[PDB]
Symmetry: none
Subunit: 31 residues, 6 copies
């Protein structure tokens, strides 16, 4: 089974005060 | 089974105070 | 089973005051 | 001339991804 | 002329990814 | 002319990834 580029920016990301997750499965993220 | 580019920006992302998730399956995200 | 490039920026990331996670499975992240 | 407590929380503030301003007069705030 | 307590929290502030300003007058704040 | 306590927390500040300014007048703050 194949997962690829799940998240992708082709361009400048100014910031992130939160959570870029690529693939979550369990637990917690207080981003 | 194949998943690809699920999320994609071809352009500048100013910020994220929240959650860009690509593929969520379980748990919690207080973004 | 194959996972690849799950998160990806082709461009300058100004900052991160949060959490870029690539693949979460359990526990906690107070980002 | 007297200004007092202009903004006030008697209780826990979870977050602020924006701008709590107390007294704005000029310029710019991209919060 | 008298300004006092312009902003005030009587309680725990979890975070601030933005700008608590007390008194702005000019210029810029990219918070 | 008198300015006092312009910003004030009576309680634990978890973090600040931004800008607590007390009194801004000019220039720039990329917080």
């Amino acid at each position: 089974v194949h997962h690829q580029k799940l998240v992708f920016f082709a361009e400048d990301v100014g910031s992130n005060k939160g959570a870029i997750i690529g693939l979550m499965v369990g637990g917690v993220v207080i981003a």
